[PDB]
Amino acid sequence: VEFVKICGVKTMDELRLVERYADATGVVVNSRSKRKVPLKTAAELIEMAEIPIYLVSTMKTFPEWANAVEKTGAEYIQVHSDMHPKAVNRLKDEYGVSVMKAFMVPRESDDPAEDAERLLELIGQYEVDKILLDTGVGSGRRHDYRVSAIIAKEYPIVLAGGLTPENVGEAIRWVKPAGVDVSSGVERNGVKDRVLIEAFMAVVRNG
Ligand code: NA
Numbered sequence: 001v002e003f004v005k006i007c008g009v010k011t012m013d014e015l016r017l018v019e020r021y022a023d024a025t026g027v028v029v030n031s032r033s034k035r036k037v038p039l040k041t042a043a044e045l046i047e048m049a050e051i052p053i054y055l056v057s058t059m060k061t062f063p064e065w066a067n068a069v070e071k072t073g074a075e076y077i078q079v080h081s082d083m084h085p086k087a088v089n090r091l092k093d094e095y096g097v098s099v100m101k102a103f104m105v106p107r108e109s110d111d112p113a114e115d116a117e118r119l120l121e122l123i124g125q126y127e128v129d130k131i132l133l134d135t136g137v138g139s140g141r142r143h144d145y146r147v148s149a150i151i152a153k154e155y156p157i158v159l160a161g162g163l164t165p166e167n168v169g170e171a172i173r174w175v176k177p178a179g180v181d182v183s184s185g186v187e188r189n190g191v192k193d194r195v196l197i198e199a200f201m202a203v204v205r206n207g
Pocket residue numbers: 013017
């Protein structure tokens with residue numbers, strides 16, 4: 001019925017773990033991230049993966065992406081930058097990658113419906129396999145949930161940012177997204193952790 005991604009694996013151990021639970025995972029490259037790995041290391045993880053594994057990056061220009069895809073043999077990419085729809089399509093046509101495009105939830109301003117219309121317009125510029133909404137922190141988070149809830153009615157989105165076993169349940173029947181993306185919420189000491197993932201999954205696994 002749904003889609004769970006566990007993002008930001010850095011080792012084979014972490015990867016084989018998430019594959020027991022998640023519908024997809026991700027390896028971060030060329031980004032500002034505690035989870036960044038070098039391209040070669042990403043390549044090795046991508047080679048052994050049994051589920052979809054996204055090449056996750058904030059890379060902004062096509063050659064950067066083209067080169068990363070070439071070195072990793074990624075079949076999936078998560079585009080976590082405002083890269084032009086045409087550049088995305090180029091990567092799709094020239095490399096056969098499937099794309100999840102990440103969108104920051106805009107907070108400014110000030111009614112959730114207005115940011116949602118600004119985001120819907122932005123989303124509709126893209127021709128991509130999946131849409132990921134990256135929610136933020138602070139009290140502005142409930143605003144992000146409402147924005148995301150509007151969006152999730154027009155597209156089967158993947159809800160992301162700040163999800164934990166303790167808050168994902170609320171997140172889900174608030175936004176009712178098609179999927180959820182989790183990274184640090186299932187890490188014990190920066191390592192993908194089984195009991196946390198199971199606890200996270202236990203909340204998801206109800207429909
Ligand atoms: Na293990």
